[PDB]
Amino acid sequence: GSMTISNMEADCNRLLKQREELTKRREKLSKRREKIVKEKNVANINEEMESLTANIDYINDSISDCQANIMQMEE
């Protein structure tokens, strides 16, 4: 349709917000863990930061896939 490509763009770009939110969340845990080891319970932070990283990497693959499909749609 007329807005099909525009909608694809908007939907693919929602992935950027996922990445941003997860990146900051991972950063919040980094500065938090840094203070604890400076002064334990970092194992829980390590487990979550590693989860966030795996999801950030997943999103990055999704961005490449999504943008590639747009390129094919536009060719």
Author numbering: 2 to 40, 46 to 81
Q: What do the authors say?
A:
Coiled-coils are important protein–protein interaction motifs present in ∼3% of all eukaryotic proteins. They consist of two or more amphipathic α-helices that wrap around each other’s hydrophobic seams resulting in parallel or antiparallel filamentous supercoils. Here, we present a case study for the phase determination of coiled-coil structures using a combination of native or engineered cysteine crosslinking together with native SAD phasing. In conclusion, our case study shows that cysteine crosslinking and phasing via sulfur-SAD is a particular useful strategy to solve coiled-coil structures by X-ray crystallography.
As a second case, we used the regulatory coiled-coil domain of the human kinesin-4 motor protein KIF21A. A recent study showed that the minimal KIF21A regulatory region folds into an intramolecular antiparallel coiled-coil monomer in solution, but crystallized into a dimeric domain-swapped antiparallel coiled-coil. Here, we aimed to stabilize and crystallize the native, monomeric coiled-coil form of the KIF21A regulatory region by rationally introducing cysteine residues (the construct is hereafter referred to as Kif21a_M947C). In the second case, Kif21a_M947C, we recombinantly introduced a cysteine residue to stabilize and crystallize the native, monomeric coiled-coil from the KIF21A regulatory region. A schematic representation of the KIF21A intramolecular antiparallel coiled-coil (amino acids 938–1017) is provided in Figure 2A, illustrating that a native cysteine, Cys1006, is present in a heptad repeat d core position. We therefore introduced the cysteine mutation in the juxtaposed heptad acore position of the coiled-coil to allow for disulfide bridge formation. The stability of Kif21a_M947C was assessed by thermal unfolding profiles monitored by CD at 222 nm, which yielded a Tm value of 37°C under reducing and 69°C under oxidizing conditions. As expected Kif21a_M947C was found to be monomeric under both reducing and oxidizing conditions (measured molecular mass: 11.3 kDa; calculated molecular mass: 9.5 kDa). The Kif21a_M947C coiled-coil fragment was crystallized under oxidizing buffer conditions. The final structure is composed of two intramolecular antiparallel coiled-coils per asymmetric unit with a disulfide bond between Cys947 and Cys1006. The results revealed the classical knobs into holes packing mode with the pairing of heptad a and d positions forming d/a mixed layers typical of antiparallel coiled-coils.
